[PDB]
Amino acid sequence: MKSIAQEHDCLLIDLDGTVFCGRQPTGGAVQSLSQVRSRKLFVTNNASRSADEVAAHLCELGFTATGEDVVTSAQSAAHLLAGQLAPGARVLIVGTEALANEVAAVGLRPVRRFEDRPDAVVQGLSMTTGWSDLAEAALAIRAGALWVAANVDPTLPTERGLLPGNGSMVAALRTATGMDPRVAGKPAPALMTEAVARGDFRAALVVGDRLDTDIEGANAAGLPSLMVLTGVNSAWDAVYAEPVRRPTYIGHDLRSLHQDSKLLAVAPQPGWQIDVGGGAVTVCANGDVDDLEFIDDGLSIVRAVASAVWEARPLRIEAGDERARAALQRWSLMRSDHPVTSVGT
Amino acid sequence: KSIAQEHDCLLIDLDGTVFCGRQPTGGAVQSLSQVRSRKLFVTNNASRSADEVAAHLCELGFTATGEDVVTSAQSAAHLLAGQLAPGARVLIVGTEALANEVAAVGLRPVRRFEDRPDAVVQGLSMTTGWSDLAEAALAIRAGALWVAANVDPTLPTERGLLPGNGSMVAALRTATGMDPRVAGKPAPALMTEAVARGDFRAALVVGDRLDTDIEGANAAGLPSLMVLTGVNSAWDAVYAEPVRRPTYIGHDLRSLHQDSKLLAVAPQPGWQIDVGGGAVTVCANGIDDGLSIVRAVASAVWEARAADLHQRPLRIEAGDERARAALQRWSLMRSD
Numbered sequence A: 001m002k003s004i005a006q007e008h009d010c011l012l013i014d015l016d017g018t019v020f021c022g023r024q025p026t027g028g029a030v031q032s033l034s035q036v037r038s039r040k041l042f043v044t045n046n047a048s049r050s051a052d053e054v055a056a057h058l059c060e061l062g063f064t065a066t067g068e069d070v071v072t073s074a075q076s077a078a079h080l081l082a083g084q085l086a087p088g089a090r091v092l093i094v095g096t097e098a099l100a101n102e103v104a105a106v107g108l109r110p111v112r113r114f115e116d117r118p119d120a121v122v123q124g125l126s127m128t129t130g131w132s133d134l135a136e137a138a139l140a141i142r143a144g145a146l147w148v149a150a151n152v153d154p155t156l157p158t159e160r161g162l163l164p165g166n167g168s169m170v171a172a173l174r175t176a177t178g179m180d181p182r183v184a185g186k187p188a189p190a191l192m193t194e195a196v197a198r199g200d201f202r203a204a205l206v207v208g209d210r211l212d213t214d215i216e217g218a219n220a221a222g223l224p225s226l227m228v229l230t231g232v233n234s235a236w237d238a239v240y241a242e243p244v245r246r247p248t249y250i251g252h253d254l255r256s257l258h259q260d261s262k263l264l265a266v267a268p269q270p271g272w273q274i275d276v277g278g279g280a281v282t283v284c285a286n287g288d289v290d291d292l293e294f295i296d297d298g299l300s301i302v303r304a305v306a307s308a309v310w311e312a313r314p315l316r317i318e319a320g321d322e323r324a325r326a327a328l329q330r331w332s333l334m335r336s337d338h339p340v341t342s343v344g345t
Numbered sequence B: 001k002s003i004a005q006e007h008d009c010l011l012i013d014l015d016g017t018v019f020c021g022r023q024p025t026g027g028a029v030q031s032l033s034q035v036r037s038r039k040l041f042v043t044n045n046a047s048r049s050a051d052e053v054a055a056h057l058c059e060l061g062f063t064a065t066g067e068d069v070v071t072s073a074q075s076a077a078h079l080l081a082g083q084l085a086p087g088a089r090v091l092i093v094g095t096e097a098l099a100n101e102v103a104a105v106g107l108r109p110v111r112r113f114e115d116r117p118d119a120v121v122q123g124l125s126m127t128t129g130w131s132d133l134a135e136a137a138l139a140i141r142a143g144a145l146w147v148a149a150n151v152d153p154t155l156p157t158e159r160g161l162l163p164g165n166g167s168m169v170a171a172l173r174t175a176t177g178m179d180p181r182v183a184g185k186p187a188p189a190l191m192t193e194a195v196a197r198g199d200f201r202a203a204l205v206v207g208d209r210l211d212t213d214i215e216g217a218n219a220a221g222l223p224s225l226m227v228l229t230g231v232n233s234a235w236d237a238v239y240a241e242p243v244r245r246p247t248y249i250g251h252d253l254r255s256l257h258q259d260s261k262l263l264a265v266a267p268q269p270g271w272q273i274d275v276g277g278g279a280v281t282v283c284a285n286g287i288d289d290g291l292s293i294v295r296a297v298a299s300a301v302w303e304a305r306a307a308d309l310h311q312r313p314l315r316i317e318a319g320d321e322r323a324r325a326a327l328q329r330w331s332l333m334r335s336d
């Protein structure tokens, strides 16, 4: 009767494929959020832009947001460091002035080179970061500096294609030093716990499309999650997800915010009978062949299969009739490592 | 009859071997001035031009020209020319010296993905940044052929160990999921190209680093002389896996004027060795430049461990006080 969005006093919406499709907002995103009355907080693992800059770009894209609605990993990385370093302690910045400013804001002293004697290194993406900047960081790390990364995402999605992410720049430093950083952003629960503490919200919901950041982060933070299937492998990835990466709910896109949570939950489904046995999970359709009473948002079979697989090397997804067959293939759940498509790329 | 007199040309590693930082290695200048075989100076770095590297050598007191130097940039260029059509566009990550070596083999150096490269070549430049890596990552993902000058994780300097080409390669591997072809040491082509340069029949590699100089030499089918002025120690030589084992060991470049029989890793008259009970145990009984015991110990360990199987390291022990002092000099014993 109520929508899932109405069951929550705030939404932590991931700023990845969940809301952006490169150039434009994702299909249905702006319309859906405009009808949400609860607080909308936009959370990003990107530490390159200030909260205000993120908000301005969101507005440009047709969304409504101010800096107060944006939470970034620059902020959580600064808090992580400030919680274990002394007041005024020096921190070498790899990244933008936005990152440096977040460090300054929590009582620490941002610094740009090894000879300035940093106690720590904080690393976020900047498109002007270069070899010499990394050389300063490598010296600091070798001399025992605490090393915090905003995220370890290998790529940065853009219009041009997939470019090196902060995770790529971390890898260079890992090769140079033999060390790994501590990650302040997702999947660490602090970013989300900080978002919730900002407005003292009591019934928060995580909304995102990445199992290893959004969903794992949510589970780590003890919050429920709505996973949206933005990618071709999202359905498959959900089904085969390890326990800490399992979402509470599964939706197609942000239209799901106005659907009933009971319909969205990963659970057994009335339209699908599942038989688990002999290394396989076999799915059969329930109604008469021309019965449409069980067709709702199209994702009921994914919820069914995920639920059967979660309650226990990997099980094979198999069809027990024509309808299951077509519905499994719609969600690319029938594979021989990749789903066969009509035209190959 | 010295070891240098037994070879057409010497493939001499630069840093750690010829010089260490600001200074030439002990006796290097005099020893090289008296060798009459061809001296090629060989470097895994692709940042500096052959002329720049020669200029540096001159500044330290070694007369050398551009033609006496072999770089990874040159090896990378040759590799590209063997895989690409003439005039093919190659995106450069690294210095203009690298871009020029690519042009020199008839390829077209380029900087952007929009220039539609067929390949990416990667060497270190201290001005390479995110934007440069972004361009190369696009090319690599779209299927461009990817060559790396070297895959060394670090670059040693006056101020410490800084990020090397291998670190920058690691960034692109993470961004793309792809892996480059490696042009420099220990890939043998760098060295087997250097011998072609003069059609030499009996070359010798000289270097300090087991995982580049010596591994490269063995892959190239060339014999090798390890010096101890650089990265690796006598301990490291003893425990070197089969692919990184040198033919000869000496203190420094003065060894080029010693008899090759004296330098060879092999049994020695002065040192009796018993292998067994998890130990190599050494006794004295019966020329020495001081490395005789190391050559004896390495030979025994290598003979006992023919293949790179994950086996228990043999411990090195003394059966008398003479062997104890000599083993301790090279840090070949363990205590608690």
Ligand SMILES: [Ca+2]
Residues within 6 Å of the ligand: A001
């Ligand atoms: Ca009602």
Ligand SMILES: [Ca+2]
Residues within 6 Å of the ligand: A292, A293, A294, A295, A296
């Ligand atoms: Ca219906």
Ligand SMILES: [Ca+2]
Residues within 6 Å of the ligand: B013, B014, B015, B016, B017, B207, B208, B209, B230
């Ligand atoms: Ca060397």
Ligand SMILES: [Cl-]
Residues within 6 Å of the ligand: B044, B045, B046, B047, B122, B123, B124, B149, B150, B165
């Ligand atoms: Cl290089």
